[PDB]
Amino acid sequence: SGFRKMAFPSGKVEGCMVQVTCGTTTLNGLWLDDVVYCPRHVICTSEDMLNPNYEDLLIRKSNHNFLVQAGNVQLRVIGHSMQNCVLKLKVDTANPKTPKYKFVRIQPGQTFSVLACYNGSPSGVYQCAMRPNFTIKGSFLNGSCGSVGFNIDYDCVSFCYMHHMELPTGVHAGTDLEGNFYGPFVDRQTAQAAGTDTTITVNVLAWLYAAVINGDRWFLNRFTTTLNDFNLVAMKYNYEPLTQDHVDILGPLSAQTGIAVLDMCASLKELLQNGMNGRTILGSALLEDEFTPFDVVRQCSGVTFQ
Amino acid sequence: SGFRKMAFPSGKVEGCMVQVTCGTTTLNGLWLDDVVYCPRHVICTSEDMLNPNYEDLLIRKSNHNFLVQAGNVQLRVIGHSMQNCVLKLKVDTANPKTPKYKFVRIQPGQTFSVLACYNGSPSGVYQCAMRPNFTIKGSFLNGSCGSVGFNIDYDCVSFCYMHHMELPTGVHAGTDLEGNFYGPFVDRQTAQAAGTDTTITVNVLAWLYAAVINGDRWFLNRFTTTLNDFNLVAMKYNYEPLTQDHVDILGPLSAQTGIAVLDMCASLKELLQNGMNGRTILGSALLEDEFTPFDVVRQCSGVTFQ
């Protein structure tokens, strides 16, 4: 037993990371088959980033202006195109380590692992959530752009995120692998408002189920509630409204524990109103929202990859 | 910027995991050169585990009684020996994916990544600390025994932990890769007391430095203290006593931030005495002790591996 914030095994993604250099800017790329995917702002200086015209900047670039290095091998660039906010560099070699993969656009509140990289080399792996306001709270220094987020399903890597920007507020913004930003963000160094963020209610409930499975039960109370009553409380505490779809996704955890979803809602309501009184749940002194119902089931049932 | 509990990239270790079966017990092994390393309790049934005589049980086993599977390849066992609490199965093939590696016995309070595995297949990676009482607070289900903990230094994997036991209290015990338990534990299903645990003070101070670097500063106060005065408070709150060795290891973070170590001690003293008043530090509502000073520097300076 026990419950940890576990990332996916990173090896299939490590084999896809490369370094991309254009003029004096270096960041990370993702090499799948004969295409390298990277943030289009690889073509910008710090000064360009204040107000970039990506079309005009890219016209000044030829195939030979992109240096792509896979460990020690230089790749030969034979094509370049811009798709939304990503560059696709066609190269003359297929990556021999390409895994089974898909490109996925995830929903707010879904989780994924980030392989943080610098100069095309991996430094670490961690699990995070796409916030309801389409930011992520990552760990990203200068040079981490082009680092990717992913999920694995047995032998298939679903790439969902490419890192582009740190907002002036210190949270992180990026794209899907088609180059479409999550949320209202642009690849420009300017003031950019993130929405009001909210807590991912269905994830907190999943994590309360994980706690019960692990024996952490002190928070279970004598009350029930309604979906409408609970949602009045969710509004006050800036929690996402719970829907029947969310109730349905929690079904298996309800079944395993014998705790009706609305009973678990009443327990959460009491924690929102009364706080935790200096107590912990699964070693946390706040309500955790970075585990999906699918994450809890995976971890509690020991699902493996290959 | 930002600060996450980051694990090492797991690919070099993924290539070393194999499945070991003896009679009707299956768990994980680690294949390095022509040796597979696994918990000796692979030779026990559930019933044997109550009071095992490992010497007598192992005598009943021959090379052909150990089934070792690397993905789909069966390995041929040509030798077996017991070293403390590990079995070393000599096999007739060197692992082509063996990384540069060492075997290290870590100190209480040091951190490492765990690759959780079932049936020789990786499920996830997470970072944890060896507790001062030589337990770990992991995520380990039935079949996870033989999963390993490690650190990476550029291209070299330092293996420090192999998982053996869940104690009746739900924390986790294991060995170094020479088969010597961390702490007083044995590979027997019996009541086993873990010591009183303590908080890893030098790690909490490292994490307060990480917070300041990231802009989380509200906890900095007007006071200083002495090593002896601080340690009186450390005793009361079950924190490890701080030594000059610990002060010296914090030197670089002191230098970077311009906050003397004893000033940061006085800030910590005030947090121990007054609590956090419903506030957070790096998104935590408790004092975090799973980052070493070396972890903070690594993460804050973007060190990479290969």
Side-chain angles (χ1 to χ4, degrees), chain B residues 4-59 61-221 223-234 237-305:
Chain B
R4 280 274 185 181
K5 191 169 290 183
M6 215 172 300
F8 292 101
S10 63
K12 285 171 176 307
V13 177
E14 291 167 51
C16 301
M17 302 304 313
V18 303
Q19 177 194 72
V20 182
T21 300
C22 190
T24 74
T25 306
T26 178
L27 44 60
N28 308 283
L30 182 73
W31 183 20
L32 299 166
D33 306 320
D34 59 352
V35 177
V36 169
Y37 300 85
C38 75
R40 67 177 178 169
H41 81 251
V42 71
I43 74 181
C44 298
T45 66
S46 68
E47 164 187 328
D48 292 326
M49 284 303 291
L50 293 170
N51 193 18
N53 191 316
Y54 280 106
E55 295 75 18
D56 288 356
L57 292 165
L58 185 51
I59 280 158
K61 300 304 181 182
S62 292
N63 288 335
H64 72 262
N65 290 130
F66 298 96
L67 275 80
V68 183
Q69 198 179 144
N72 274 302
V73 54
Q74 298 282 161
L75 302 185
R76 182 184 302 279
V77 182
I78 63 167
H80 72 270
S81 62
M82 185 161 54
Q83 178 176 19
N84 301 310
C85 297
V86 294
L87 218 54
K88 297 191 304 205
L89 309 175
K90 181 78 92 201
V91 291
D92 75 350
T93 302
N95 182 354
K97 303 189 190 169
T98 307
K100 300 197 208 168
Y101 77 91
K102 298 171 188 198
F103 293 171
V104 169
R105 195 173 170 85
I106 56 164
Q107 294 291 304
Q110 290 191 275
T111 57
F112 57 96
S113 295
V114 172
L115 180 68
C117 294
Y118 299 86
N119 301 123
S121 296
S123 42
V125 66
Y126 61 86
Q127 182 82 175
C128 66
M130 181 57 71
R131 302 306 317 163
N133 73 358
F134 290 103
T135 62
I136 73 161
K137 295 177 99 108
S139 181
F140 292 109
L141 300 165
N142 214 321
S144 63
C145 303
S147 296
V148 298
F150 59 97
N151 284 270
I152 309 178
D153 177 358
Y154 183 54
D155 60 355
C156 183
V157 181
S158 283
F159 295 102
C160 58
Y161 178 84
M162 181 170 269
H163 180 53
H164 290 239
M165 302 294 281
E166 189 167 84
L167 306 187
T169 68
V171 304
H172 296 120
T175 70
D176 65 24
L177 270 293
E178 292 187 330
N180 306 107
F181 268 87
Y182 295 98
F185 308 113
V186 296
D187 47 353
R188 178 182 174 196
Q189 184 183 334
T190 188
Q192 303 194 59
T196 311
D197 199 30
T198 57
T199 301
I200 309 151
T201 310
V202 68
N203 289 184
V204 175
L205 288 163
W207 169 88
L208 289 181
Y209 279 107
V212 167
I213 290 164
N214 279 278
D216 226 350
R217 262 179 312 96
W218 65 258
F219 54 83
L220 299 174
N221 73 16
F223 302 82
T224 204
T225 186
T226 71
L227 206 52
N228 278 27
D229 173 70
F230 174 77
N231 281 337
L232 281 196
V233 173
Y237 284 94
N238 289 338
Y239 270 53
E240 285 295 296
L242 201 74
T243 66
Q244 189 61 42
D245 278 354
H246 299 319
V247 174
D248 286 345
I249 291 155
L250 292 169
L253 293 176
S254 191
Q256 178 173 358
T257 61
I259 290 162
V261 177
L262 288 179
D263 293 2
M264 192 64 91
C265 292
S267 281
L268 177 55
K269 168 176 160 182
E270 290 306 299
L271 287 166
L272 291 173
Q273 293 176 164
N274 294 111
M276 261 188 263
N277 270 310
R279 306 185 65 134
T280 61
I281 298 172
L282 287 178
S284 173
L286 48 77
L287 304 174
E288 176 60 57
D289 80 342
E290 284 203 318
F291 300 95
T292 69
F294 287 170
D295 294 338
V296 169
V297 162
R298 282 202 290 108
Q299 182 156 170
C300 296
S301 74
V303 306
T304 59
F305 306 97

Side-chain angles (χ1 to χ4, degrees), chain A residues 1 4 137 139 166 299, chain B residues 1 4 137 139-140 166 299:
Chain A
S1 61
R4 280 274 185 181
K137 295 177 99 108
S139 181
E166 189 167 84
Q299 182 156 170
Chain B
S1 61
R4 280 274 185 181
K137 295 177 99 108
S139 181
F140 292 109
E166 189 167 84
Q299 182 156 170

